[PDB]
Write a protein that binds this ligand. Structure first.
Ligand SMILES: Nc1nc2c(ncn2[C@@H]2O[C@@H]3COP(=O)(O)O[C@H]4[C@@H](O)[C@H](n5cnc6c(=O)[nH]c(N)nc65)O[C@@H]4COP(=O)(O)O[C@H]3[C@H]2O)c(=O)[nH]1
Ligand SMILES: Nc1nc2c(ncn2[C@@H]2O[C@@H]3COP(=O)(O)O[C@H]4[C@@H](O)[C@H](n5cnc6c(=O)[nH]c(N)nc65)O[C@@H]4COP(=O)(O)O[C@H]3[C@H]2O)c(=O)[nH]1
Ligand SMILES: Cc1cc2nc3c(=O)[nH]c(=O)nc-3n(C[C@H](O)[C@H](O)[C@H](O)COP(=O)(O)O)c2cc1C
Ligand SMILES: Cc1cc2nc3c(=O)[nH]c(=O)nc-3n(C[C@H](O)[C@H](O)[C@H](O)COP(=O)(O)O)c2cc1C
Ligand SMILES: [Mn+2]
Ligand SMILES: [Mn+2]
Ligand SMILES: [Mn+2]
Ligand SMILES: [Mn+2]
Lengths: 392, 394
């Protein structure tokens, strides 16, 4: 089974130059007996390599390549099965693009390779035309940042539920943007643990009802000028005819403003019925409450949803964040949600941010609002401690 | 009830500069009795106006504003129900951005506006305002791509067959080149795919869908396949519920004098997403075989770029729903521009389909579409290659 692997990487710019003639010859000598072929592209700052061979030969080679100190920021762009070798007879071969006139490098490629409808070919072009695009800038290296560190956890009695709060942060302004309320059982357990105790047919009712205790928690904080974010299933919003009006009454009694309350609905559940949700949407807009699409990029129905309606906020799902520093796929998609939301005036939050590596690459694709264990953990009935990225 | 209406537009650079003083006086004087507030930004080439008022008032005004000869390329950005007026003052203020340095324009805006208890940056209107001040010229339509600077410039039935195919050219206007042909199934009487499949038993539809393609392959083999690609439409089930569909297609296209790489399979976006994990083995086999894969009708229904996380197609066809009235829709403009950029980063080819007007071609090309399919260029041609119309100057 033939397979194609493509990645891009960067040189260490303050270190002595790597002898690439030696690298490439040694590589070509090693690749061909093992049934590995392909090319290397160098532009002065970045590498771009295509590899062809069996799944097993490429995996073992790429592990060595990943851990090679002679470059950094290895980002995979393509891993897929292949119909034929595009570089038959070429173990390895470098093209220094700086030695080439316009179109010249591509025309050399085409003369030893074995045409514009190919995914490998289009990416090559894309690297030659604009390689420095998803290059991680020097200030935004994870090694040039440092996370720096008191919460008051409290049990509230006489309550059928309680809530933890997680900060959504804007590290560029060292500012809390908003807090998300996350439901907990009476004994501090998970959302699942909470809803499992409630009878199945009362779960929509309970979901709506429980929000009153989150508003109360926001009121006694006393929150001030920060937004409150709240997870509701669409079905909970259809429970009572005046579910929106009840939310309003409840949040005002907690001393909150409507523009201060934001509703989080999951991407998968909105696409179920646009007929009944739009009546709720209209009620939320008229009342002044804001809407967010939670876990965007997970439930398949992505960016075309904006044709039907536009939320105030979009929360990028954790799956798009996991290993976004090594995935070109994820980088491209996330960066396209950013740019689309910027033109539409939609707030973008990245979720499940756990590592400096994740924060840096997300910052480099243009995300400013962040939510994750890296910055802030859920804190039962209070504001938890917040960690900020500090420069080096 | 209260409504927001935000748009941007572009002045005619050919014509004399617009009297803004007369504009703003008659605007604010007419707006005042009608209960219309808001703001107007101007950068020299572009207008950007926020309008607040009742739904019926803003509709009536937008009619006149769209009809106004003092500007063109009116692009609607936001229209929704509002809870409170962001601009509370009388009438209409004008803010010439040329006379402000960085951050200075937002300062001035915040003098005439409140955005609730929370930071102004949490409001969509304020974000759209900030975006215009930062880079309003982004979706400004260039001069060479104005519609007024362009203009547009036989085979029979085969009823004795179980089915026939119409061919439609996918074109690249810039290089005056036909990129590929799509095969669209037709009934023995020349009728639509719907009528065709309606005549086939439900238990037999998948098999028919796959086995019909032999007639499409035979058609393209009889035609000048001059290093052009052939696109064909298949349901997921048609590939999935066959013993070895890829092998069958391989046998059928090779027999007809075609290369594996000349054949591209189109699958509809909606029918793939709730099917994917089961459908993986077929997509894999098509890759190894050498055939190409397109996501047909991208944007249609309930799917998007989140699909591209899973697997990556060779081609993406933006649905006509997104191409429809893209010239007046900033939402579609932003969506399509984003998909184009995304696919460039992923090495995925993009076709805009259902292109009907010079207007659509212009706006699509400006946001980075190079490949087109629609009635503007080429209509479906039964059993042959149709006449392709090209856009040229004046
Ligand atoms: N691995 C990882 N996880 C992180 C990170 N940051 C936050 N999380 C977790 O992600 C969940 C918040 O996202 P969610 O879409 O609201 O996912 C929530 C939310 O959908 C939900 N939920 C919470 N409250 C309610 C509610 O009142 N009603 C409904 N219907 N659902 C709720 O149940 C889900 C489970 O929530 P939680 O236990 O609160 O788990 C929280 C949070 O702990 C991180 O950096 N890494
Ligand atoms: N208004 C407008 N329409 C345009 C324009 N350009 C093309 N079309 C039409 O859009 C349809 C092609 O899009 P499709 O995604 O393949 O959507 C097609 C395609 O999915 C499909 N179909 C065609 N052949 C087959 C087939 O063999 N198998 C399957 N499963 N579906 C097929 O049935 C759908 C309807 O097809 P058609 O009657 O052939 O109608 C064609 C075509 O006539 C345009 O500029 N404006
Ligand atoms: C940009 C880059 C491309 C590389 N390409 C290859 C290659 O194609 N084949 C290979 O064997 N090693 C390649 N390497 C080197 C490997 O990381 C590793 O050092 C080498 O395979 C060690 O093999 P050896 O110990 O047998 O000499 C590359 C390294 C870098 C920096
Ligand atoms: C960019 C621009 C913004 C405009 N804004 C307004 C406005 O806010 N209110 C208004 O009444 N007319 C506005 N107009 C003018 C209208 O298009 C139209 O000329 C106006 O209704 C005058 O018609 P009249 O004969 O009833 O006075 C605007 C025109 C332009 C080109
Ligand atoms: Mn949530
Ligand atoms: Mn979430
Ligand atoms: Mn099609
Ligand atoms: Mn289509």
């Amino acid at each position: 089974m033939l397979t194609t692997l493509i990645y891009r990487s960067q040189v260490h710019p303050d270190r002595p130059p790597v002898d690439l003639d030696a690298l490439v010859h040694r590589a070509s000598s090693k690749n061909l007996p093992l049934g590995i072929t392909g090319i290397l592209l160098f532009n002065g700052l970045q590498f771009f390599q295509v590899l062809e061979g069996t799944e097993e030969a490429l995996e073992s080679l790429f592990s060595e390549i990943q851990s090679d100190p002679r470059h950094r920021d290895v980002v995979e762009l393509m891993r897929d099965y292949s119909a034929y070798r595009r570089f038959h007879g070429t173990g390895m071969r470098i093209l220094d693009l700086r030695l080439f006139e316009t179109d010249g490098a591509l025309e050399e490629i085409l003369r030893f390779s074995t045409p514009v409808n190919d995914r490998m070919f289009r990416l090559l072009s894309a690297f030659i035309a604009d390689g420095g695009r998803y290059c991680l800038p020097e200030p935004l290296q994870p090694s040039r940042w440092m996370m720096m560190p008191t919460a008051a956890p409290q049990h509230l009695p006489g309550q059928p539920c309680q809530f933890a709060l997680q900060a959504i942060v804007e590290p560029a302004k060292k500012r809390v943007s908003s807090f998300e309320a996350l439901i907990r059982s009476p004994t501090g357990g998970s959302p699942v643990e909470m809803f499992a105790a409630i009878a199945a047919e009362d779960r929509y009712r309970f979901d709506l009802e429980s929000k009153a205790y989150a508003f109360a928690l926001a009121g006694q904080l006393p929150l001030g000028k920060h937004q409150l974010a709240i997870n509701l299933l669409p079905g909970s919003l259809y429970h009572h005819p005046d579910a929106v009006g009840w939310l309003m009454d409840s949040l005002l009694a907690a001393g909150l403003r409507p523009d201060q309350v934001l509703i989080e609905v999951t991407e998968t559940e909105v696409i179920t019925c646009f007929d009944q949700f739009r009546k709720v949407l209209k009620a939320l807009r008229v009342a002044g409450m804001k809407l967010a699409i939670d876990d965007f990029g997970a439930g398949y129905s992505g960016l075309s949803l904006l044709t039907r309606f536009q939320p105030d906020k979009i929360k990028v799902d954790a799956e798009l964040v996991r290993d976004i520093h090594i995935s070109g796929t994820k980088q491209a998609i996330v960066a396209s949600v950013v740019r689309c939301c910027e033109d539409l005036g939609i707030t973008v939050v990245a979720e499940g941010v756990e590592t400096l590596e994740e924060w840096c690459w997300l910052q480099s694709v243009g995300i400013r609002l962040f939510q994750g264990f890296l910055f802030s953990r859920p804190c039962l009935n209070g504001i938890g401690e917040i960690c900020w990225p500090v420069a080096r």
